[PDB]
Amino acid sequence: DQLTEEQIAEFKEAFSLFDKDGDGTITTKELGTVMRSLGQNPTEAELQDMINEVDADGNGTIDFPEFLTMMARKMKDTDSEEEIREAFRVFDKDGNGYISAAELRHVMTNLGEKLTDEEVDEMIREADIDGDGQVNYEEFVQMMT
C-alpha cells in the first residue's frame, strides 16, 4: 500500500475540480487532464492504453478509485524524478554525485522533518550494507517511493 489518508486528501482536492456534478466517475479525456494538473506526465499513447482498459464503445468513464489505481499503475515512471536529481546536483559541494555519510547524518539530525537516531540508522541501512563512509546521490531518489 503506497497510500496514506493525507495523500488521498490532496488527490481528492484536485479531483473535486472535475466532479462538478458529484457523480464521482470521469469521462476518458479528463484522465490525462487530472494527471498533468497534479504534474504527472504520461504520453498520449500511455493514456490510450489506459483508455483501452475501460472504454470499449467511445463513451466510458473512470471511477475515483480506478483513477487512483491508474495513478498508482504509473507512479515511479515520471518526469518529476529529474527535478529531485536536480536538487542534489545543486546541493553537491564537489560536483561528482557522492556525499559523506557523516554529512548525511548531520544534515538529517538538524534539517527539515529532522530524523531521529533509528530513522538515520535505517536511512544508512537502506543505501548499502557494503557502504564505506560515502553515498551515491541517486539512491536518495530510489528510497523516495
Binding site: 529531485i84 536538487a87 527539515g112 522533518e113 530524523l115 530513522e119 535505517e122 536518495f140 517511493t145
Partner: protein, 48 residues
Amino acid sequence: IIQKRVRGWLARTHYKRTMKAIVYLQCCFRRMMAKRELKKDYKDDDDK
C-alpha cells in the same frame, strides 16, 4: 543595489526549491520507515 539583490534572489530561489523537495522526500522516507517499524514490532510476538 540592483546587482546584489539579484545575486541574493538566485541563491534564495534555488534554496527554496531544494528545501521543498528535501522536506517532501523526508516525509516520504518517514512514511517508509514507519511502515518498516510496524512490520518489526509484530515479530516480537514470535521471538518468544
